[PDB]
Design a protein around this nucleic acid. Sequence first.
DNA 1: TTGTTAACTAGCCA
DNA 2: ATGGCTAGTTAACA
DNA 3: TTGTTAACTAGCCA
DNA 4: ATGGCTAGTTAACA
Lengths: 249, 249
Amino acid sequence: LPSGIELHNRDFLTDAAHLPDASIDLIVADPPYGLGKDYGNDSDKRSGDDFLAWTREWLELAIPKLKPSGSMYIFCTWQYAPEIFSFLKTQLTMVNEIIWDRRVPSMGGTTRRFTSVHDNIGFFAVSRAYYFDLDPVRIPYDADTKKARSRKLFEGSKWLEMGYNPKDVWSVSRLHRQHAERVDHPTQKPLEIIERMVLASCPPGGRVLDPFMGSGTTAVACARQGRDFVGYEINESYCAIAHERVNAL
Amino acid sequence: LPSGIELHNRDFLTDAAHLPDASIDLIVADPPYGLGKDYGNDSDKRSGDDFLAWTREWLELAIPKLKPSGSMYIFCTWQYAPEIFSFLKTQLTMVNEIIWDRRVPSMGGTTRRFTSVHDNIGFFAVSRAYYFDLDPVRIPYDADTKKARSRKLFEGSKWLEMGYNPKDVWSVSRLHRQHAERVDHPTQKPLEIIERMVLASCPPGGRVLDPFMGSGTTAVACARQGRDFVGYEINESYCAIAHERVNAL
DNA sequence: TTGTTAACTAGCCA
DNA sequence: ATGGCTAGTTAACA
DNA sequence: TTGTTAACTAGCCA
DNA sequence: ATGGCTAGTTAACA
Ligand SMILES: Nc1ncnc2c1ncn2[C@@H]1O[C@H](C[C@@H](N)CC[C@H](N)C(=O)O)[C@@H](O)[C@H]1O
Ligand SMILES: Nc1ncnc2c1ncn2[C@@H]1O[C@H](C[C@@H](N)CC[C@H](N)C(=O)O)[C@@H](O)[C@H]1O
Ligand SMILES: OC[C@H]1O[C@@](CO)(O[C@H]2O[C@H](CO)[C@@H](O)[C@H](O)[C@H]2O)[C@@H](O)[C@@H]1O
Ligand SMILES: OC[C@H]1O[C@@](CO)(O[C@H]2O[C@H](CO)[C@@H](O)[C@H](O)[C@H]2O)[C@@H](O)[C@@H]1O
């Protein structure tokens, strides 16, 4: 694999010790949500106080690995977001809560509540001096839409000419099973979302840690965009897929 | 003043005794977020532990008013939601976390974080047997979309023939100052989303409590849908607007 | 145009 | 305390 | 077609 | 301690 792409087929909680502290620029964490999915293991078969307990366990291993300029995005479900976010706010400062609007709702058959269509992303920072560069993640307008938004009072503004902030709600559809990007993983994440996080919060060439990389989506994002990557995945097939994904760019 | 609609220019926290315990079917709470706004008072000038203590205070007076079949929606900001939702999960059960996608981002000037385009809403219930009816709030398809979505596998399905679950992300644009629904209030909530709350979670004839009603958006929703309403707002200018909005029906 | 499917069924009754 | 049966669930990829 | 604005800048310096 | 100054911020209503 490319230079700084480290794919470790190891359990993160037993191998984090090997990771030097204050050595990571960004953590992109998409840990098991506690939703009972089949990852080839029981990672997502915990729930309630056990899952929160386990979530603190790995969080405490990972946080020290952050450089004083580093940041972290952590995916979770509204079912455990308040407790997780509350805990992280005693360790880090929360810069943002990003809502990933997945467009395609979860199935089931319910009629007694609203259907799930968002995941929660918590954007945290070690200190007020965190690295964040908006320019590479700015969304430029097409011609028609730029014409619709332009006004004398805005002419020349950066948001208008270079592009606008993605905001705290990211509308990006889940990857259909037949989507070109899809691989044999149950909980894949659109590269679009992961790349944005990598480009705005990791200095180019910086190091990004993904404690539970699955298909190496973060790896791919770091490969392109030129950034370093350390990642752990217990499932060997996932580690496999990941290598494949990174050895195709 | 229509019958069933009752409006008060008082502090809820001090008049809660007047509200019989277990008399309300739904609480639509759009309380101060803790963001520095000026409602003619300093209610939104609290922050940190001081905001949350006040938040959990009025919450403790409101909850016992909910009948066993009751439910609640509480608007809040990501900056205090994890704490608020964590506290409420110890009292009630959380059925959903609804994201209000405001569409129009907050202004300021930053480039150091993601701009805000969502407020948070916690949907809670006293008991597992909470009232909830989706049919009044199903979103029907237009000829074009129904055609795009229809497949033999889905033909005859309630969600296709009648309309879909609005989901837990609600993309409804904030009300522009020049919008015909806009009245002189700094933080008005679109009736579209308040009405949805009233329709799904309050039986026709039920009583709705809004402890910080502001401009009366919940009063109007109930009036238009045949629900009873009780509301509180310490600012009389706002209270007058609420009278007007209700009376113009 | 179409087959297919994706991190987040649930209330009864037995 | 625990299943299983039912009526029920969408946007977008190929 | 264009004016205008909405629940949530942020760091520096005299 | 405290303004003030800076570079800077969008979709949609009328
Ligand atoms: N202790 C552990 N160490 C490393 N990986 C783990 C551990 N426990 C669970 N996992 C993996 O973490 C992954 C969580 C997934 N959400 C990762 C998905 C990944 N973001 C993707 O886009 O493909 C699963 O594939 C698990 O197998
Ligand atoms: N103790 C209190 N009792 C009643 N109202 C209060 C109290 N404290 C603050 N408020 C009001 O609560 C309101 C909160 C607003 N967000 C209401 C807006 C309302 N949802 C609307 O759509 O117009 C403000 O108008 C405050 O003045
Ligand atoms: O408020 C529901 C919320 O609680 C969670 C964990 O945060 O589950 C806990 O509470 C449930 C209450 O219905 C219990 O069923 C469950 O056993 C307990 O762990 C989430 O499941 C849910 O989002
Ligand atoms: O700090 C950004 C600041 O700009 C404000 C201040 O009024 O307003 C925006 O909209 C105004 C109405 O025309 C413009 O005059 C102003 O230049 C523009 O930035 C607020 O939205 C915001 O706090």
